[PDB]
Design a protein around this ligand. Structure first.
Ligand SMILES: CCCCCCCCCCCCCCCCCC(=O)OCC(COC(=O)CCCCCCCCCCCCCCCCC)OC(=O)CCCCCCCCCCCCCCCCC
Ligand code: HEA
Ligand code: HEA
Ligand SMILES: CCCCC/C=C\C/C=C\C/C=C\C/C=C\CCCC(=O)O[C@H](COC(=O)CCCCCCCCCCCCCCCCC)COP(=O)(O)OCCN
Ligand SMILES: CCCCC/C=C\C/C=C\C/C=C\C/C=C\CCCC(=O)O[C@H](COC(=O)CCCCCCCCCCCCCCCCC)COP(=O)(O)OCCN
Ligand SMILES: CCCCC/C=C/C/C=C\CCCCCCCC(=O)O[C@H](COC(=O)CCCCCCCCCCCCCCC)COP(=O)(O)OCC[N+](C)(C)C
Ligand SMILES: CCCCCC/C=C\CCCCCCCCCC(=O)O[C@H](COC(=O)CCCCCCCCCCCCCCC)COP(=O)(O)OC[C@@H](O)CO
Ligand SMILES: CCCCCC/C=C\CCCCCCCCCC(=O)O[C@H](COC(=O)CCCCCCCCCCCCCCC)COP(=O)(O)OC[C@@H](O)CO
Ligand SMILES: CCCCCC/C=C\CCCCCCCCCC(=O)O[C@H](COC(=O)CCCCCCCCCCCCCCC)COP(=O)(O)OC[C@@H](O)CO
Ligand SMILES: CCCCCCCCCCO[C@H]1O[C@H](CO)[C@@H](O[C@H]2O[C@@H](CO)[C@@H](O)[C@H](O)[C@@H]2O)[C@@H](O)[C@H]1O
Ligand SMILES: C[C@H](CCC(=O)O)[C@H]1CC[C@@H]2[C@H]3[C@H](O)C[C@@H]4C[C@@H](O)CC[C@]4(C)[C@@H]3C[C@@H](O)[C@@]21C
Ligand SMILES: C[C@H](CCC(=O)O)[C@H]1CC[C@H]2[C@@H]3[C@H](O)C[C@@H]4C[C@H](O)CC[C@]4(C)[C@H]3C[C@H](O)[C@]12C
Ligand SMILES: C[C@H](CCC(=O)O)[C@H]1CC[C@H]2[C@@H]3[C@H](O)C[C@@H]4C[C@H](O)CC[C@]4(C)[C@H]3C[C@H](O)[C@]12C
Ligand code: CUA
Ligand SMILES: [Cu+2]
Ligand SMILES: [Mg+2]
Ligand code: NA
Lengths: 84, 46, 259, 79, 227, 514, 58, 79
């Protein structure tokens, strides 16, 4: 490809700054708009004690040994189901 | 600066061949003996 | 006196403190995983930080302050950094191999499908896409920073570098939040395993990369770099592009194709 | 009826040393068919072939585990 | 089984193991020829007072020692691959038997018609009947019909194991969560031994395999009575 | 001054010396372990206990011989000592990082010893395959200490690889092209490239085993959708390159030794030797699955791996015939080093040939996991790698120390070792063909004769190892200082005397471009 | 900020025979002693831990 | 029995404007079921649901062409 713009006479600092503020940051601003829009807590699915999930072959070296490192009560059920 | 030349570019001394024999004996002997004593250790635990 | 251009380094204690800190960290991880204690690990992490700090400090002293980095020495450092990055690529390759192995032939325990039954993947068009625009954008700003430095523009170099760092931090915060929000965990079978270990090691590299860029920012503030000699910045930029490319592969493989 | 089965015959879909999927597939097929017949008012005897094949190929512990899970509601496969 | 002071392979019990014996004889001759040729040349280079120490040209003799080995490798690969594909041939078995590896014994399952299954443990040395082989006998043998194509499925319920019977040219790893297939076909009746071939812990050396090959008729009666 | 010199070193010679010392010590540990193995198999029955203590011994023997003896000696020892001298460099590119590659080894070794001290040790085989190596079949810290040992040894080698490649590419005289560097330097660079590419995959794999054991991941656990075979692929992807990493520096030293004692100014077909090592290095990355011929792979995959594996015989053959062609027309000096090199050529060839037998997946069905494999690798390792190390050691000892060994005693040492290793491993071919499995603490009665003879051979080797320690002592005890060495015009490493001064090449060599 | 690299160059090139890791002054000494103490002390402690883990506590 | 069909209900597998595969899938399903039942000695009435769905969704000319092709032996789908 070749994009859809032009310059190339000499790619320098001014050109890269132009790309930073004219293309890169605007893209980040759009994706930030999109993300902080499609967010919203999606309703957690019913719990099913699947044997291939919530694996426990050895307790974790922290807490009560049954909670994952970044455990989220709202969406991460324990092997026995969601928490209170 | 450091000492240079035969017998001076090493971490052990070769000034006395008997003291050297003692060094080498402990050095190589400890290595060879270690597995036997670890085996003994494992047998004496259960 | 020497009549070659290479660097004869002063006897240093850091290789030893670094090696011992490695023993303390591994010993420490063992103590933590099996004898419920973090004491060894804490000491190990501390001496490791101290070793790296002093070792790299000395490299700056030897180069910026003592002038030991002749063109030959700098050429060697270039090869060294490229080789290091190559080994990092191969490390990630092992994780990608594990991902594709598991996902291309889903076993019966998963329901014989991918993603496994019970797994609800994140939407690749949401935060994961944002993360992608964040890293690609930082690739552009670090290039502006590079050109500014070469053109002798101090203000704009600092400005561009600051933007690059902010973007790296933004990615890290976004990823941290995603980790907390994810409905699946590292214990959720091979899907959680591959997902967290691969993106986790990648996140670690982003933190290392940002730290490297921060070091460059402060060395720049202190006028260490000349418009022609600034290998530290070049290495940080190559490492940063590497981190960027690994993300693109993770994005396409795990977040998109693997969903 | 069209049977007289000795053992599960060669299946071109699973021609290699790894036969894990062959067992799995037939187990799924039988239980899918058994569910369709028990539902729409028909006879499970049509599902016979799959039953014989999976019985022949699948380790007893696998079938036993899968059966326990279908009852528990944790069977990961689609039936 | 292996006998005292054995040098080569156990006598072939299946047509495929016979095939391997001839392929090995073919390969071993090449191994002997090349290794003795190298030993000879070493001695030839070292037994003369004549010298030639100036620069010697190599782009001529290297053609010889590149093309020759290439030809030899093809002469080994041809029969090797013919046999490889032969072992993969579709044969359509008359019986399917499964074996699950465990720490440390094998269990067998004949579930084509009836739900027959049993464990197979090594007979402790202290318990051997006179004339029985130490470390090789088991309480329950794998009764199988001779001169018949049998499909063996191998897996494990714990760690890795490997199901082997040298006289039949068999070795199939027993991997948990995986069902490996191999085919068995004995040209003769008898007892055929093998041993676990993947390190599995404490008693890896003590979980043998014993096949009992008998005519179909006896196989059937045995089947029934083992209900 | 002692601490600054030996603990804070930034000198390639001193660092090479540390490596040689460490490797010599490790060799004693590895020898002891091999004696325990053969003592257990010396007569029918059980000597030490069941397969657990036995396999903890077998596993440690392998790790020690490979990671703590062979690699440190060849790469860290001879590599550090000779590479800079052979290209006229003042030192390594990263002299300080070089010191860390060394210092990571003692901690790495301590973790290996710790793993055998705690619990019941790691009796998993050096391949550490799960689930046996998992947290249920090997619960406790042992396997975790083993993984950590490998991590440290891994980092040591990766940093060492970066240092060697950089030094070799960047620090030769301006006029010297890569095609003007000695074959040993070529062997080290290629070895460094293999290490750089292979170790990171191993690291990935053992890290996944670590998480499966401690963080509840399931990369190799079918219950979570994992696969034990995935580990095998990851391990062997590193594992095969690893065996070539163990022999390449050996090939390099053999080229130097054969050339030197043939009274030749150069090895026959230099460019063919470079081509051969590069080809071997390349091919070594696409053949790993030949260690998995019985796991249940598709037949086409097996036909490919059989074929790809046999191709390596071609470049390896060029090296063997080139060594013979270097001897051709030479004024042969029957020194002890030459003897080790001649034994290497023959014994390595035998080991390589049985490797070709094993490449055939058809035959490997029956030979896999039997003593035929053990025979194969001990001919290439215990005879190949070890003879190259012994040859290089007796050849360069005068250079490193400034003293000469007693040649007659060195020739006696060679004779004893030659008998020992052959008596130990030759009978193992029979045991393999006849079906004796690997990793067994006891065997059926029929295997008694060959196991008895093999164990006696191992005692002969022990006698050789003890004699070697005495021989080194005698050299340092008598102090016969080196005066002159022949052929310095084509062996630059000797040109600064014995031992060379701490700092060499402060004023670089002069080399015209013409 | 102002460019003080020249000052730092003077300090680190001062012919006082000090190795680069201690040439900055007294603080280098302290940091070094802290680092080395934690390393060696921590190593002794790890050896002690190995000794403890080597034996069963039934 | 379990019917009382008005028209083919929403199918989560085909939630988009392009409904081509919905028709095709149900056509295949019916003929596969019909073949299984007529074979193993059972009743085609179990296949009814698929017949109603494909008849509702599929253009007459498509069904007609597919039928002609199954008869001719040129039907590209697997039945
Ligand atoms: C130590 C125990 C010895 C027991 C001996 C046999 C007893 C037989 C009884 C009675 C003998 C007759 C009745 C039984 C016949 C069985 C035939 C069979 O089933 O056949 C297959 C069998 C038996 O094969 C044989 O047919 C035996 C072959 C023996 C070759 C020996 C070379 C020995 C050299 C020096 C002595 C050994 C140590 C050093 C070996 C150094 C490396 C070769 O199994 C093998 O394949 C074993 C070998 C594996 C491959 C090694 C390949 C490279 C080897 C040597 C190259 C040397 C070249 C220069 C020439 C040789 C130069 C030195
Ligand atoms: C370099 C690698 C190496 C070396 C040299 C050896 C050497 C020996 N090994 Fe081996 N061995 C392995 C690597 C090696 N081994 C591996 C990888 C395995 C497989 C492990 C597994 O299955 O998991 C194994 C397995 C193994 C087994 C099979 C165990 C089983 O399956 O149950 C046996 C059995 O006899 C054995 C015996 C021996 C013996 C008697 C020696 C003797 O020849 C040793 C004689 C002594 C020496 C040759 C050392 C001399 C070197 C020095 C002391 C350095 C000197 C110093 C200077 C010159 C500076 N080894
Ligand atoms: C120094 C180490 C070293 C080296 C260099 C090699 C070299 C080779 N190895 Fe070996 N190998 C090991 C160490 C080594 N190996 C180890 C440690 C194991 C076991 C690991 C474990 O399970 O623990 C092993 C296992 C092993 C296996 C797995 C067997 C099994 O587990 O069932 C196979 C399979 O193909 C194999 C093949 C080869 C081949 C073909 C070569 C080739 O590179 C050899 C090429 C050389 C020659 C062929 C000789 C010289 C050539 C000529 C004179 C030219 C003419 C020749 C012909 C025309 C054939 N090796
Ligand atoms: C914010 C994004 C950046 C990621 C990293 C940041 C913080 C974590 C701490 C260290 C991570 C460094 C490397 C990754 C190692 C393991 C994967 C961790 C990735 C991660 O952080 O994964 C988390 C698991 O944490 C866990 O177990 C982690 C448990 C923490 C203990 C670390 C275990 C240490 C093992 C290290 C092995 C080192 C070997 C490396 C060798 C290198 C080469 C020799 C996921 O959380 P979860 O609750 O399961 O799911 C979320 C549900 N809401
Ligand atoms: C599905 C898998 C998923 C995982 C994938 C994850 C990530 C993707 C991969 C990569 C992307 C990451 C980062 C890329 C960004 C920057 C890298 C830096 C390159 C750079 O900027 O290089 C420059 C020039 O090129 C040079 O080095 C050229 C010189 C190079 C020297 C080093 C190489 C030596 C090593 C061995 C040699 C190989 C030999 C080849 C022949 C072998 C035949 C078989 C710097 O100059 P220098 O060193 O002085 O050389 C002087 C030559 N001009
Ligand atoms: C699967 C196994 C494969 C088996 C291996 C087969 C081995 C090959 C066998 C024979 C090779 C024949 C090569 C013929 C070369 C002639 C030798 C010669 O005589 O050597 C020189 C030629 O230079 C030159 O090629 C340079 C010198 C000789 C070059 C070749 C010598 C090396 C041969 C190999 C050495 C033995 C190793 C064999 C490996 C198995 C002599 O030079 P000139 O006479 O011009 O000058 C002398 C001055 N005059 C003119 C007054 C006489
Ligand atoms: C690369 C350029 C050279 C080109 C040569 C080709 C070599 C490798 C590339 C091909 C990889 C894709 C092939 C996948 C298609 C098959 C799908 C599949 O299914 O393959 C799967 C594994 O593939 C997998 O992970 C494959 C995982 C990858 C393994 C390859 C290892 C090489 C990686 C190292 C190279 C470093 C590169 C640096 C990166 C820039 C599973 O195996 P099956 O046996 O089917 O098991 C199923 C059984 O139930 C039935 O028998
Ligand atoms: C919470 C955070 C903690 C996490 C742990 C890791 C933390 C930080 C790692 C960040 C790396 C910082 C590196 C700083 C290096 C500063 C020294 C430097 O950059 O030194 C430069 C040389 O490059 C050099 O050595 C280049 C040096 C290369 C270093 C790059 C290595 C990265 C380290 C990765 C380690 C982990 C591996 C992955 C784990 C699985 C000096 O030369 P110049 O710049 O030309 O200056 C000279 C001019 O002034 C002349 O006029
Ligand atoms: C279970 C947990 C396991 C943990 C294991 C941890 C192992 C060690 C931890 C402590 C090590 C950190 C201390 C800092 C190391 C910096 C080395 C460095 O920066 O080395 C540089 C060379 O490598 C270069 O450039 C380029 C190369 C930069 C390498 C940076 C070092 C990072 C070490 C980790 C490597 C991991 C391997 C990655 C693949 C998986 C500088 O070379 P020197 O010889 O110093 O000087 C030469 C002078 O001319 C400079 O003026
Ligand atoms: C290759 C580079 C990788 C090197 C290794 C990475 C090292 C990772 C260190 C993780 O350490 C931690 O350990 C803990 C476990 O002890 C935590 O505390 C916790 O654990 C507890 C102890 O039981 C609880 O009391 C608390 O709730 C708390 O979450 C914790 O925050 C965290 O810092
Ligand atoms: C002080 C310095 C000017 C050059 C000098 O030091 O003489 C200025 C120029 C550009 C730098 C700034 C850049 O414009 C980028 C940043 C923008 C601000 O929003 C916060 C501080 C910020 C991080 C920088 C701080 C500022 O103090 C810098 C460092
Ligand atoms: C072209 C290259 C270098 C020559 C030089 O510049 O000196 C040489 C070195 C080694 C040679 C190779 C080796 O001699 C091995 C092979 C020998 C056959 O005679 C031809 C192909 C063959 C594969 C050679 C091709 C080519 O002539 C190579 C690759
Ligand atoms: C072994 C590895 C798969 C590892 C894994 O399961 O994770 C696979 C991936 C791709 C495979 C290769 C590619 O599919 C291409 C080739 C296909 C041929 O049928 C055999 C060789 C062939 C070269 C393959 C060999 C082997 O099966 C490879 C290398
Ligand atoms: Cu079971 Cu070894
Ligand atoms: Cu290999
Ligand atoms: Mg095996
Ligand atoms: Na024994």
């Amino acid at each position: 490809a070749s994009a859809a713009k032009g310059d190339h006479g000499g790619t320098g600092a001014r050109t890269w700054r132009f790309l930073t503020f004219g293309l890169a940051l605007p893209s980040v601003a759009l994706c930030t708009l999109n993300s902080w829009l499609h967010s919203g807590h999606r309703e957690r699915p019913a719990f099913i004690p699947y044997h291939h999930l919530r694996i426990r072959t050895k307790p974790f070296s922290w807490g009560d040994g049954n909670h994952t490192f970044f455990h989220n009560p709202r969406v991460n059920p324990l092997p026995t189901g969601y928490e209170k | 600066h450091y000492e240079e030349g035969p017998g001076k570019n090493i971490p052990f001394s070769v000034e006395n061949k008997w003291r050297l024999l003692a060094m080498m004996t402990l050095f190589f002997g400890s290595g060879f003996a270690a597995p036997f004593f670890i085996v003994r250790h494992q047998l004496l635990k259960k | 006196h020497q009549t070659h251009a290479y660097h004869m380094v002063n006897p240093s204690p850091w290789p030893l403190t670094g090696a011992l800190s490695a023993l303390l960290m591994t010993s420490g991880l063992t103590m933590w995983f099996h004898f419920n204690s973090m004491t060894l690990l804490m000491i190990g992490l501390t001496t490791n930080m101290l070793t790296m700090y002093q070792w790299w400090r000395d490299v700056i002293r030897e180069s910026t302050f003592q002038g030991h980095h002749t063109p030959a020495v700098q050429k060697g450092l270039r090869y060294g950094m490229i080789l290091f990055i190559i080994s990092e690529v191969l490390f990630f390759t092992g994780f990608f191999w594990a991902f594709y192995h598991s996902s291309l032939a889903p076993t019966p325990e998963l329901g014989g499908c991918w993603p496994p039954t019970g797994i609800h993947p994140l939407n690749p068009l949401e935060v994961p896409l944002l993360n992608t625009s964040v890293l690609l954008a930082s690739g552009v700003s670090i290039t502006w920073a590079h050109h500014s430095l070469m053109e002798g523009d101090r203000k704009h170099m600092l400005q561009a570098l600051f933007i690059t760092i902010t973007l790296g931090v933004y990615f890290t915060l976004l990823q941290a939040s995603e980790y907390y929000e994810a409905p699946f965990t590292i214990s959720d079978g091979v899907y959680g395993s591959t997902f967290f270990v691969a993106t986790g090691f990648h996140g670690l590299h982003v933190i290392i990369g940002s730290t490297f860029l921060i070091v460059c920012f402060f060395r720049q503030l202190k006028f260490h770099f000349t418009s022609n000699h600034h290998f530290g910045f070049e290495a940080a930029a190559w490492y940063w592009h590497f981190v960027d490319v690994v993300w693109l592969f993770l994005y396409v493989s795990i977040y998109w194709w693997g969903s | 009826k069209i049977k007289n089965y000795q053992t599960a015959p060669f299946d071109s879909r699973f021609p290699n040393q790894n036969q894990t999927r062959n067992c799995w597939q037939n187990y799924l097929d039988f239980h899918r068919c058994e569910k369709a017949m028990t539902a729409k008012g028909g006879d499970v005897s049509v599902c016979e072939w799959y039953r014989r094949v999976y019985k022949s190929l699948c380790p007893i512990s696998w079938v036993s585990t899968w059966d326990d899970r279908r009852a528990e509601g944790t069977f990961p496969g689609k039936i | 089984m292996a006998y005292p002071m054995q040098l080569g392979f156990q006598d072939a019990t299946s047509p495929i193991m016979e095939e391997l014996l001839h392929f090995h004889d073919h390969t071993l001759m090449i191994v002997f020829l090349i290794s003795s040729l190298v030993l000879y040349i070493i001695s030839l280079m070292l037994t003369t007072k004549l010298t030639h120490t100036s620069t010697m040209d190599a782009q001529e003799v290297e053609t010889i020692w590149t093309i020759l080995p290439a030809i030899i490798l093809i002469l080994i690969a041809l029969p090797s691959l013919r046999i490889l594909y032969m072992m993969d041939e579709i044969n359509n078995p008359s019986l399917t038997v499964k074996t699950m590896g465990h720490q440390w014994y094998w269990s067998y399952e004949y579930t084509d018609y009836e739900d027959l299954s049993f464990d197979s443990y090594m007979i402790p040395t202290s318990e051997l009947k006179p004339g029985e082989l130490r470390l090789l006998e088991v309480d329950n043998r794998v009764v199988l019909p001779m001169e018949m194509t049998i499909r063996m499925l191998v897996s494990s319920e714990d760690v890795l194991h490997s199901w082997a019977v040298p006289s039949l040219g068999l070795k199939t790893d027993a991997i948990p969560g995986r069902l490996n297939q191999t085919t068995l076909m004995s040209s003769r009746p008898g007892l055929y031994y093998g041993q676990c071939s993947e390190i599995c812990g404490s008693n890896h050396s003590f979980m043998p395999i014993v096949l009992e090959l008998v005519p179909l008729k006896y196989f059937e009666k045995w089947s029934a009575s083992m209900l | 001054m002692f601490i600054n010199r030996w603990l804070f070193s930034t000198n390639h010679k001193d660092i090479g010396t540390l490596y040689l010392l460490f490797g010599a010590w490790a060799g004693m540990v590895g020898t002891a372990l091999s004696l325990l193995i053969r003592a257990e198999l010396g007569q029918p029955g059980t000597l030490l206990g069941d397969d657990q203590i036995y396999n903890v011994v077998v596993t440690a023997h392998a790790f020690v011989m490979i990671f703590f003896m062979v690699m440190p000696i060849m790469i860290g020892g001879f590599g550090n000592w000779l590479v800079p001298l052979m290209i006229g460099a003042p030192d390594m590119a990263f002299p300080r990082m070089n010191n860390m590659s060394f210092w990571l080894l003692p901690p790495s070794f301590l973790l290996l010893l710790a793993s055998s001290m705690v619990e019941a040790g790691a009796g998993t085989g050096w391949t550490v395959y799960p689930p046996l190596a998992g947290n249920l079949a090997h619960a406790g810290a042992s396997v975790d200490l083993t993984i950590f040992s490998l991590h440290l040894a891994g980092v040591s080698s990766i940093l060492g690889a970066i240092n060697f490649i950089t030094t070799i590419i960047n620090m030769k005289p301006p006029a010297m092209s890569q095609y003007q560097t000695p074959l040993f330097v070529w062997s080290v660079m290629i070895t460094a490239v293999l290490l750089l590419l292979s170790l990171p995959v191993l690291a990935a794999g053992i890290t996944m085993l670590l998480t499966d054991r401690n963080l509840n991941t399931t990369f190799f656990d079918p219950a979570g959708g994992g696969d034990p075979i995935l580990y095998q692929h990851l391990f062997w992807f590193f594992g095969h390159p690893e065996v070539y990493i163990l022999i390449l520096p050996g090939f390099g030293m053999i080229s130097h030794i054969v050339t030197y004692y043939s009274g030749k100014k150069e090895p026959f077909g230099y460019m063919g030797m470079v081509w051969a090592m590069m080809s071997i290095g390349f091919l070594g990355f696409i053949v790993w699955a030949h260690h998995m011929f019985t796991v249940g792979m598709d037949v086409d995959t097996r036909a490919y791996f059989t074929s790809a594996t046999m191709i390596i015989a071609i470049p390896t053959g060029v090296k063997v015939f080139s060594w013979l062609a270097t001897l051709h027309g030479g004024n042969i000096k029957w020194s002890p080093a030459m003897m080790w090199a001649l034994g290497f050529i023959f014994l390595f060839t035998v080991g390589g040939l049985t490797g070709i037998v094993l490449a055939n997946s058809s035959l490997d069905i029956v030979l896999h996991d039997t003593y035929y494999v053990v025979a194969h690798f001990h001919y290439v390792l215990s005879m190949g790698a070890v003879f190259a190390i012994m040859g290089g050691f007796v050849h360069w000892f005068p250079l490193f120390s400034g003293y000469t060994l007693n040649d007659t005693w060195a020739k006696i040492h060679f004779a004893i070792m030659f008998v020992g290793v052959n008596m130990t491993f030759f009978p193992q071919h029979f045991l393999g063909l006849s079906g004796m499995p690997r990793r067994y603490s006891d065997y059926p009665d029929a295997y008694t004769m060959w196991n008895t003879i093999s164990s006696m051979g191992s005692f002969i080797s022990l006698t050789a190892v003890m004699l070697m320690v005495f021989i080194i002592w005698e050299a340092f005890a008598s102090k016969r200082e080196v005066l002159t060495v022949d052929l310095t015009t084509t062996n630059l490493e000797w040109l600064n005397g014995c031992p060379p001064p701490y700092h060499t090449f402060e004023e670089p060599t002069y080399v015209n471009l013409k | 900020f102002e460019n003080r690299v020249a000052e730092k160059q003077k300090l680190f090139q001062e012919d006082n025979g000090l190795p680069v890791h201690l040439k900055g002054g007294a603080t280098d000494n302290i940091l070094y002693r802290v680092t080395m103490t934690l390393c060696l002390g921590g190593t002794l402690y790890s050896l002690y831990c190995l000794g403890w883990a080597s034996f069963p506590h039934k």
